[PDB]
Amino acid sequence: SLKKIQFFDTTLRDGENFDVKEKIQIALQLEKLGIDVIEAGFPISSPGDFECVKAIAKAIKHCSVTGLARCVEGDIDRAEEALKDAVSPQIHIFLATSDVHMEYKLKMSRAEVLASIKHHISYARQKFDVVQFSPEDATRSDRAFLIEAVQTAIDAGATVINIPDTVGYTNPTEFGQLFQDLRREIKQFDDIIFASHCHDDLGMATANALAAIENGARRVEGTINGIGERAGNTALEEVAVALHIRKDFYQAETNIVLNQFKNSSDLISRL
Amino acid sequence: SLKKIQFFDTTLRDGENFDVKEKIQIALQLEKLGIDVIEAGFPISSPGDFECVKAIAKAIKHCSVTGLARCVEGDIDRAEEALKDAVSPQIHIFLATSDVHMEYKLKMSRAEVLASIKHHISYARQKFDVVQFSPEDATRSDRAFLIEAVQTAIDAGATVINIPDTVGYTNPTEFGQLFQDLRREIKQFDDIIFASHCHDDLGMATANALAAIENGARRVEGTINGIGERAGNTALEEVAVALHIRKDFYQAETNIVLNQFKNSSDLISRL
């Protein structure tokens, strides 16, 4: 039917072997496939990444290109530099919101986390019209606080909120509920693009992405083939095919060119 | 916690290359793994199957062995013959319950279907203490009628009801609801073992098996690796690992020896 699901591919990021011309090649196949957003890299991470993100940003003419940044002004500056020639640039910023991460990793309190999010999302918003924000480790976050962190990013200018199952152990019941909670508590929900980024540790990343869509998500992030990370990401091909075959149930359309999926798939496998 | 999930493996059936000694070898690895029921074959289908089912029935001493039969007295006779030396034999009988199958395949009305089910389940029950029944194509069956066919099998002596997503296009929402409906409409539900047999056409077989367990199923049928059929079956390893890792959520135990999963897996892949 009428609701539109966007696709966000992070294949070029979770190459964790791809050389430069190979990244460019993949990127152009992704674009051909009708992927809406290509995450090209994490520019601050190394000079190589920086040049690679620039390279893909220059090659792409028909979709959006994005790069990763922490809540650190330098990363955002570097991403803005990397993406300056993108036809439709975005930036993807993240910060963990779970108790364990805040205590042991960030060494920051809830108040500090919300304050970092507000500052860095606003900071980025001055440079990018489209700011995606991900509360890292969302699925193990205190739920009230997860809602706080997400409201904070929205207030500050984030127009895409991506919910990752960073650990990979959620299920459709638990994840769908997470989205229900966001819908109920975030007044701006219907004006904001919500995405998921599921991991396949338990073999449920596809079901999890679709449960998020049944519950409000209008975007799915993942990879060609579901490669990456420990136990893999959401296989975008599986999600697109489920939406197509059960259009009666999901009532959604996408921009994907279905017949370009095996090209995309064989290319990625080949490398 | 306290509820027990049984595992039903059909690897030796959806070898659709395995030779005789290889089937016996797999069967004994399955048994080692702690699988509760091994479906050894479909005895009526060929004399080879018959001898293979006999062979596995003789080798197995610590779990149950089962074979397939249609609702045809000859199949059941042949299965009874095949399994006569099983330490804990069962039989698995099936009949389609969807409008399309009844019209185009069976060429039988609803009344005829229920009457076949009653007759052949009772027939089998005289020979086997444990009769499993599967309404083939359950997930595309009229729901009221699916409930009729399942009630009929129970009344007639079936103590295990297996719900297959024969076509492979269901999802956790739709499947969980199917189980909710059975629970609400079948007075004997809590006295009857309910299982699922999901297919992985959409990449959701694992999530689907777990959704059936959240909703009353106390048994899961599938294969080592999820091999078989068109697009594969439920990967029993994924289901067992999800139950273990999220015991907090699923609150279930199994009889599986988790550390025997890679042996089982490498054996099956090797062949």
UniProtKB/Swiss-Prot annotation, chains A, B:
Start and end residues of each Pyruvate carboxyltransferase domain: 5-262
One annotated Gene Ontology cellular component of this protein: cytoplasm
Keywords: Amino-acid biosynthesis, Branched-chain amino acid biosynthesis, Cytoplasm, Leucine biosynthesis, Manganese, Metal-binding, Transferase
Chain residues that bind Mn(2+): D14, H197, H199, N233
Superkingdom, natural source: Bacteria
Compartments, as annotated in UniProt: Cytoplasm
Broad class of where this protein is predominantly found: cytoplasm
Enzyme class, spelled out: transferase
Coiled-coil residues: none
Needed co-factor(s): Mn(2+)
Keyword flag Transmembrane helix: no
GO MF terms held by the record: 2-isopropylmalate synthase activity; acetyl-CoA C-acetyltransferase activity; manganese ion binding
Annotated EC: 2.3.3.13
Catalytic activity of the protein: 3-methyl-2-oxobutanoate + acetyl-CoA + H2O = (2S)-2-isopropylmalate + CoA + H(+)
Record GO biological process: L-leucine biosynthetic process
Family named by the database record: Belongs to the alpha-IPM synthase/homocitrate synthase family. LeuA type 1 subfamily.
Subunit architecture: Homodimer.
Name of this chain's protein: 2-isopropylmalate synthase
